[PDB]
Amino acid sequence: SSFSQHARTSGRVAVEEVDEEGKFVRLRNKSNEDQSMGNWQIKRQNGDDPLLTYRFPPKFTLKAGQVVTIWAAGAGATHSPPTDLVWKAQNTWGCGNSLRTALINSTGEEVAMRKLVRS
Amino acid sequence: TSQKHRDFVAEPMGEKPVGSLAGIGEVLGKKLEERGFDKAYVVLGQFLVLKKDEDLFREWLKDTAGANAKQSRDAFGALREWADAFL
Amino acid sequence: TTSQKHRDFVAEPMGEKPVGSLAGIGEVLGKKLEERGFDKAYVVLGQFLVLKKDEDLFREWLKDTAGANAKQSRDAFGALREWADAFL
Amino acid sequence: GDNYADLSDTELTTLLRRYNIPHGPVVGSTRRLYEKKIFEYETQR
């Protein structure tokens, strides 16, 4: 699909799917235990563009095995916590030939990443 | 691109054996282990101290463990893609 | 007991950070490492990995190659080791 | 015996720089490779 994928997951939550056309980022708690994600951040680096930062609410739990999808404002999704969050101030996650989406925890450490790169 | 390449570059390598690296066939992998490059990360290290340079790396792999051109090309390519994603 | 420099190095992939970003690499030490060709942190990572993450070989190499003292080689080793456990 | 194995790591680096041979640092696992580069360079005059 022109994009190759590379992923690192060091804790319970993975960056499971990144839409190539910038509509959403999808996280999955791939473990059997709930994950507190209060004040976690998704950081999206597209090529040489300015960095995009989405902050989770000060309290947020991704339950065991469950998924949360963060939608860009332009996708037209329905805001419905905790499975579907809309990023109302940002129109797209961004496109290009190198899309890097990192999950950062509350103390500033990168705990998961998914990178898409096109030939 | 090969399956071995895609499986190696898709995720962190940790302590995978040197044969997990694309291009590392059976004899090549045995020769690398005898020379102390038993894990993929040790070959990564050599790639990094050669400053990711293709010609230096492929010449080192050929002279140290007898890699042919296709093997050294695929090992180099796999390490460069891995490092671009994970370093 | 851990420094901000250390915490910032192990928190994320090192990419193309200069050698001076690694914990324990002070001003004089980093300049001597750059003169020996170690301009980026990842080149020091490379030497760490080819020495098979061995503490004694790595710290002795850093002392004899670039004049690092015991505290500096301890902190650089610790930060490289913790980074590799998290990201390699 | 061999003028290339007897060079110190510093002298090796000086020769790599003097001859404009692209290189990273001289370490144990790169010593043999750079000795060969200098040998080949000096053979091509």
Swiss-Prot record, chain A:
User: What outcome follows a substitution of residue 101 to K?
Assistant: In EDMD2; interacts with itself and with wild-type LMNA and LMNB1; no decrease in the stability compared with wild-type
> Mutating residue 12 to C: what's the consequence?
In FPLD2; increase in nuclear blebbing and formation of honeycomb-like structures in the nuclei with no accumulation of prelamin A in skin fibroblasts; causes oligomerization of the C-terminal globular domain of lamins A and C under no-reducing conditions and increases binding affinity for DNA; increases sensitivity to oxidative stress; no significant differences in stability and structure compared with the wild-type
Outcome of altering residue 96 to R?
In CMD1A; uncertain significance
List the expressing tissues.
In the arteries, prelamin-A/C accumulation is not observed in young healthy vessels but is prevalent in medial vascular smooth muscle cells (VSMCs) from aged individuals and in atherosclerotic lesions, where it often colocalizes with senescent and degenerate VSMCs. Prelamin-A/C expression increases with age and disease. In normal aging, the accumulation of prelamin-A/C is caused in part by the down-regulation of ZMPSTE24/FACE1 in response to oxidative stress.
Known outcome of mutating residue 55 to Q = In FPLD2; interacts with itself and with wild-type LMNA and LMNB1; no decrease in the stability compared with wild-type
Q: What is the effect of changing residue 114 to P?
A: In EDMD2; mis-localized in the nucleus; does not alter nuclear size or shape
- Subcellular location(s) per record: Nucleus lamina; Nucleus envelope; Nucleus, Nucleoplasm; Nucleus matrix
What is the annotated signal peptide range for this record? none
Renumbered to this chain, the Polar residues biased-composition regions fall at 1-8
| Sites of Phosphoserine modification | 2, 4, 31, 36, 106, 119
What residues bear N6-acetyllysine in this entry? 23, 30, 59
The covalently linked position for Glycyl lysine isopeptide (Lys-Gly) (interchain with G-Cter in SUMO2), per the record, is 23, 43, 59
What result is annotated for mutating residue 55 to L? Answer: In FPLD2; abnormal nuclear localization in a honeycomb expression pattern in about 10% of cultured skin fibroblasts from heterozygous patients; no effect on protein level
**Domain LTD residues, every copy:** 1-118
Q: Where does the record place the modification Phosphothreonine? A: 69, 78, 83
Q: Which family does it belong to?
A: Belongs to the intermediate filament family.
Protein's name according to its UniProt entry: Prelamin-A/C
Tell me which species this is from.
Homo sapiens
Curated annotation (Swiss-Prot), chain B:
Provide any one GO MF term from the record.
Answer: protein homodimerization activity
**Impact reported for residue 6 to E:** Complete loss of LEMD3/MAN1 binding
Which SUPFAM superfamilies does the UniProt entry name for this protein? Barrier-to-autointegration factor, BAF
Resulting phenotype, residue 52 to E: Reduces binding to dsDNA
Q: What is the effect of changing residue 12 to A?
A: No effect on LEMD3/MAN1 and enhances histone H1/H3 binding
Localization of this protein: Nucleus; Chromosome; Nucleus envelope; Cytoplasm
Q: Mutating residue 39 to E: effect?
A: Reduces histone H1/H3 binding
Task: Relate the outcome reported for changing residue 49 to E.
Answer: Complete loss of EMD, and histone H1/H3 binding. Reduces dsDNA and LEMD3/MAN1 binding
**UniProt-reported outcome of changing residue 2 to D:** 75% cytoplasmic localization
The reported effect of residue 45 to E is: Abolishes homodimerization, preventing ability to cross-bridge DNA. Abolished ability to mediate nuclear membrane reformation at the end of mitosis. Abolished ability to outcompete CGAS for DNA-binding, leading to innate immune activation
Q: In which tissues is it expressed?
A: Widely expressed. Expressed in colon, brain, heart, kidney, liver, lung, ovary, pancreas, placenta, prostate, skeletal muscle, small intestine, spleen and testis. Not detected in thymus and peripheral blood leukocytes.
Quote the PTM field. Non phosphorylated BAF seems to enhance binding between EMD and LMNA. Dephosphorylated by protein phosphatase 2A (PP2A) following interaction with ANKLE2/LEM4 during mitotic exit, leading to mitotic nuclear envelope reassembly. (Microbial infection) Phosphorylated by poxvirus B1 kinase (VPK1) on serine and threonine residues, leading to BANF1 relocalization to the cytoplasm, loss of dimerization and impaired DNA binding activity.
Q: How changing residue 27 to A affects the protein?
A: No effect on histone H1/H3 binding
Q: Which GO terms describe its biological process?
A: chromatin organization; chromosome organization; DNA integration; mitotic nuclear membrane reassembly; negative regulation of cGAS/STING signaling pathway; negative regulation of innate immune response; negative regulation of protein ADP-ribosylation; negative regulation of type I interferon production
Annotated effect of mutating residue 4 to A:
Complete loss of LEMD3/MAN1 and histone H1/H3 binding
Curated annotation (Swiss-Prot), chain D:
Phosphoserine PTM positions: 8, 29
Q: How is it modified after translation?
A: Found in four different phosphorylated forms, three of which appear to be associated with the cell cycle.
Q: Where in the cell is it found?
A: Nucleus inner membrane; Nucleus outer membrane
Domain LEM: where? 2-45
Q: In which tissues is it expressed?
A: Skeletal muscle, heart, colon, testis, ovary and pancreas.
Q: Which residues form a coiled coil?
A: none
What is its biological role? Stabilizes and promotes the formation of a nuclear actin cortical network. Stimulates actin polymerization in vitro by binding and stabilizing the pointed end of growing filaments. Inhibits beta-catenin activity by preventing its accumulation in the nucleus. Acts by influencing the nuclear accumulation of beta-catenin through a CRM1-dependent export pathway. Links centrosomes to the nuclear envelope via a microtubule association. Required for proper localization of non-farnesylated prelamin-A/C. Together with NEMP1, contributes to nuclear envelope stiffness in germ cells.
User: What disease is linked with this protein in Swiss-Prot or TrEMBL?
Assistant: Emery-Dreifuss muscular dystrophy 1, X-linked: A form of Emery-Dreifuss muscular dystrophy, a degenerative myopathy characterized by weakness and atrophy of muscle without involvement of the nervous system, early contractures of the elbows, Achilles tendons and spine, and cardiomyopathy associated with cardiac conduction defects.
Q: Kindly state the subunit structure of this protein.
A: Interacts with lamins A and C, BANF1, GMCL, BCLAF1 and YTHDC1/YT521. Interacts with TMEM43; the interaction retains emerin in the nuclear inner membrane. Interacts with SUN1 and SUN2. Interacts with ACTB, SPTAN1, F-actin, CTNNB1 and beta-tubulin. Interacts with TMEM201. Interacts with NEMP1.
Q: What is this protein called?
A: Emerin
**What species does this protein belong to?**
Homo sapiens
Q: What is the lineage of its organism?
A: Eukaryota, Metazoa, Chordata, Craniata, Vertebrata
